[PDB]
Amino acid sequence: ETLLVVGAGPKALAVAAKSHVLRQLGLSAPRVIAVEAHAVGGNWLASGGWTDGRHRLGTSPEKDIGFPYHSTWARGHNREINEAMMAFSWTSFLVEHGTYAEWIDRGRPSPQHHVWAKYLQWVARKIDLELVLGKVRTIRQGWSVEVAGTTELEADGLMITGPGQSTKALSIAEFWDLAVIGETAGSALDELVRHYFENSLFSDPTKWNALSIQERRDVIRRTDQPLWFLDLFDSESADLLELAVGGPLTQQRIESSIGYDLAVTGLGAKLYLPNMAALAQGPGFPNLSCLGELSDRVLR
Amino acid sequence: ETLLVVGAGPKALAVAAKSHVLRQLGLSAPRVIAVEAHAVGGNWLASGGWTDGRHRLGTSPEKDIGFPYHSTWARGHNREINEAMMAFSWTSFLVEHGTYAEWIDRGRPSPQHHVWAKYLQWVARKIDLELVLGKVRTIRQRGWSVEVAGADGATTELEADGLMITGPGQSTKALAAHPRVLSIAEFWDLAGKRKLPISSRAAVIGGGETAGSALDELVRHEMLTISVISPYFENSLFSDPTKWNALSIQERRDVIRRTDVFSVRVQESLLGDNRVHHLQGRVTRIVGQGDGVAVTLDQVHNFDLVVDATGGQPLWFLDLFDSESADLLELAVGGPLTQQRIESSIGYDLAVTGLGAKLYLPNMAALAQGPGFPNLSCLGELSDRVLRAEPA
Ligand SMILES: Cc1cc2nc3c(=O)[nH]c(=O)nc-3n(C[C@H](O)[C@H](O)[C@H](O)COP(=O)(O)OP(=O)(O)OC[C@H]3O[C@@H](n4cnc5c(N)ncnc54)[C@H](O)[C@@H]3O)c2cc1C
Numbered sequence: 227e228t229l230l231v232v233g234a235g236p237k238a239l240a241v242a243a244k245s246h247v248l249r250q251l252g253l254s255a256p257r258v259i260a261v262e263a264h265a266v267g268g269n270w271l272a273s274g275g276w277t278d279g280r281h282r283l284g285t286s287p288e289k290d291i292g293f294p295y296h297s298t299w300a301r302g303h304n305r306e307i308n309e310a311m312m313a314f315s316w317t318s319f320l321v322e323h324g325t326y327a328e329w330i331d332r333g334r335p336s337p338q339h340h341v342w343a344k345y346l347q348w349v350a351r352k353i354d355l356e357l358v359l360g361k362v363r364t365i366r367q368g369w370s371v372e373v374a375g376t377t378e379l380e381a382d383g384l385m386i387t388g389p390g391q392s393t394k395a396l397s398i399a400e401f402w403d404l405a406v407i408g409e410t411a412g413s414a415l416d417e418l419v420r421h422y423f424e425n426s427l428f429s430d431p432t433k434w435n436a437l438s439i440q441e442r443r444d445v446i447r448r449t450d451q452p453l454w455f456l457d458l459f460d461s462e463s464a465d466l467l468e469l470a471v472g473g474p475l476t477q478q479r480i481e482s483s484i485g486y487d488l489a490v491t492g493l494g495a496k497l498y499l500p501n502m503a504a505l506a507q508g509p510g511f512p513n514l515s516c517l518g519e520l521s522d523r524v525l526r
Numbered sequence: 527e528t529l530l531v532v533g534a535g536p537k538a539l540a541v542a543a544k545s546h547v548l549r550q551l552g553l554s555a556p557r558v559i560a561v562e563a564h565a566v567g568g569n570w571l572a573s574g575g576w577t578d579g580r581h582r583l584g585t586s587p588e589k590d591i592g593f594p595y596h597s598t599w600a601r602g603h604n605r606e607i608n609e610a611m612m613a614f615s616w617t618s619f620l621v622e623h624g625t626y627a628e629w630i631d632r633g634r635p636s637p638q639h640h641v642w643a644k645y646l647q648w649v650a651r652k653i654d655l656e657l658v659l660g661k662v663r664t665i666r667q668r669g670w671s672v673e674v675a676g677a678d679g680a681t682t683e684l685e686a687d688g689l690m691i692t693g694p695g696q697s698t699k700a701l702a703a704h705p706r707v708l709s710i711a712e713f714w715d716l717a718g719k720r721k722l723p724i725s726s727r728a729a730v731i732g733g734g735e736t737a738g739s740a741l742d743e744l745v746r747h748e749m750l751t752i753s754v755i756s757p758y759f760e761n762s763l764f765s766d767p768t769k770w771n772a773l774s775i776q777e778r779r780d781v782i783r784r785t786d787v788f789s790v791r792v793q794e795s796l797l798g799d800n801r802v803h804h805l806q807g808r809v810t811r812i813v814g815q816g817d818g819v820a821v822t823l824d825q826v827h828n829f830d831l832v833v834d835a836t837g838g839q840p841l842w843f844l845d846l847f848d849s850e851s852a853d854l855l856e857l858a859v860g861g862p863l864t865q866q867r868i869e870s871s872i873g874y875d876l877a878v879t880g881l882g883a884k885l886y887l888p889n890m891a892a893l894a895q896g897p898g899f900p901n902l903s904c905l906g907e908l909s910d911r912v913l914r915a916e917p918a
């Protein structure tokens with residue numbers, strides 16, 4: 227009945243929103259709480275350090291919080307959840323702001339990172355996101371999260387989102403105040419020269435486990451600081467994570483551990499790591515390719 | 527309280543869904559009946575004679591039944607209506623069918639007309655459109671009573687308070703009676719049969735989607751030549767006419783004229799065909815000339831075959847009115863029934879100003895209200911104008 231999320235980004239909002247509709251439809255769903263160091267949609271803003279905010283989303287903005295508003299496998303009230311959910315869509319956003327015609331008339335431009343933010347923030351308003359402003363300091367098991375506002379929050383499930391800190395590698399974060407490695411790569415390479423089947427799986431990965439591990443890894447390869455989050459775990463809880471995983475915390479190990487609901491599910495408590503559910507469950511889960519199956523996974 | 531619509535296509539659905547929304551949502555609206563001679567969305571099917579049904583819609587399909595879900599002016603339960611209305615969108619249609627991931631993933635391909643008919647049809651199922659299957663034959667004041675003839679041979683008279691005309695004419699109607707002048711429908715029939723005379727000096731009149739589709743069919747036949755005859759801020763005026771009145775008649779007239787050319791896809795297939803040439807000017811005169819047909823623009827051209835893909839004859843509807851109602855409109859409109867005169871009469875609710883009963887003529891509304899009303903560019907504003915506007 228209570229699910230904590232590190233970061234208030236697309237995934238956080240994706241999970242929250244789906245929870246908002248489920249319970250509001252007579253169905254059960256976790257109460258959803260995001261802890262967020264900076265702001266809803268923070269990593270899409272200039273002050274987030276990962277981008278200037280000016281470069282454009284590199285996937286179609288329709289691929290949003292509820293996309294693709296469909297399940298190959300789900301149970302119960304599918305028609306009505308989808309419908310409810312489209313209320314929080316990109317198109318729904320444009321139409322509340324009365325700019326939907328402008329969008330269409332301009333040729334559907336891909337939005338700036340900073341407007342994608344406005345979107346996220348808007349979804350937060352729309353579902354009255356239960357939001358804790360603060361920085362997750364440490365995590366431990368049932369989970370208890372130390373948030374520096376310094377205080378603790380107990381929750382039953384836990385989701386980690388974000389690619390980490392734009393400051394920790396210059397660092398990309400430093401790079402936007404003023405030999406380059408790695409989309410993010412795509413952008414900053416940009417501002418330096420001056421100074422159907424594969425795609426289906428990203429949005430629909432329910433045929434994922436019917437092609438070789440060699441094949442999947444290839445889809446993940448060519449797709450283009452992943453373990454940053456380990457730091458948040460005390461030794462005690464990282465230990466407990468080393469166990470379920472069945473060895474030291476690399477990602478041959480972490481990735482393969484990750485179950486159908488995006489949770490490891492070798493522990494006494496659920497830890498959701500969608501950013502590492504590419505190889506196991508579907509290559510879109512790490513990003514914006516299918517936020518709606520992601521939400522579907524952790525709540526249904 | 528009751529609104530009769532000639533034809534069940536985008537505009538009928540635009541208005542009837544907005545009706546259905548509003549009635550279910552407390553607010554008042556008329557029961558909306560649509561009389562349709564063929565099928566819901568029939569003019570987007572091959573069987574409607576206007577298209578082979580396989581060509582693609584040239585406007586973004588997001589410009590649908592409720593677009594753009596926003597009024598500068600209309601107030602009332604707006605969020606609840608836009609939210610209700612988006613249920614009937616292209617997007618929703620794709621989502622209810624599971625195909626939305628594929629649509630996005632394929633690059634948002636524009637739908638084939640016949641898929642756009644499936645959309646229209648789906649919306650009809652979804653709003654439980656009150657549909658009457660027959661041809662409107664006669665319209666007449668006294669509200670309106672309209673004669674509808676079923677295929678069963680029966681003929682009944684529906685009555686209504688208000689009436690909207692939709693549709694662009696008849697596909698079987700060339701602009702000139704001559705067997706070498708072909709209505710668009712005869713074209714599809716003959717194209718389909720490969721019975722278009724080999725090595726003809728063919729002409730296609732028209733400059734829009736109807737002409738675009740047919741040029742694209744006709745390049746597939748062994749024609750000798752194929753001559754084509756036609757005469758952001760802008761774009762925005764199609765979706766949002768609110769600032770249309772802040773423009774002169776030569777300004778407003780020159781947006782409506784650019785409204786005519788062709789698809790980027792079709793453009794290529796024509797750009798890269800040595801037989802296809804473009805001819806400028808206006809068809810002042812068509813007359814048979816023995817073996818061929820002679821078309822005047824002056825300049826005279828002869829052709830072994832002419833295809834009328836103008837996309838409609840806009841006063842076609844007048845042929846439905848009886849003398850009484852025609853005169854009655856001639857009086858309201860202030861002179862004889864020319865295009866110009868009838869356009870000049872269109873009010874803000876899209877109806878003829880100063881007429882005893884309500885006659886909604888969206889297709890005539892470009893000049894006076896906005897250039898999107900005739901087409902798929904602002905169906906949601908249209909529905910508003912005919913249902914939610916109050917004074918004048
Ligand atoms: C510039 C950029 C562009 C991208 N473009 C796309 C794209 O176009 N399409 C696509 O599919 N994917 C793309 N990606 C991949 C992308 O990272 C994921 O799609 C995206 O991160 C999903 O957001 P999220 O919810 O996982 O985390 P984010 O939205 O990045 O949110 C993480 C949040 O956590 C907060 N935070 C950080 N540390 C802490 C802490 N210790 N405690 C509490 N809060 C914290 C931050 O302020 C931030 O708000 C892009 C990535 C970047 C960096």
Ligand SMILES: Cc1cc2nc3c(=O)[nH]c(=O)nc-3n(C[C@H](O)[C@H](O)[C@H](O)COP(=O)(O)OP(=O)(O)OC[C@H]3O[C@@H](n4cnc5c(N)ncnc54)[C@H](O)[C@@H]3O)c2cc1C
Pocket residue numbers: 532533534535536537538561562563564565566567568569570574576577582583584585660661662663692693694695735736837900901902903
């Ligand atoms: C092939 C084609 C392509 C077009 N492409 C576009 C486009 O891509 N984008 C755009 O904005 N606009 C385009 N247009 C302009 C187009 O006509 C309008 O945009 C669109 O027609 C809206 O249709 P409607 O509701 O007015 O009527 P329609 O969709 O034509 O339907 C009218 C209905 O009337 C029925 N009918 C005819 N006579 C009678 C009668 N006596 N009684 C009862 N029913 C009758 C027909 O069966 C038909 O179903 C196109 C037009 C054509 C012909």
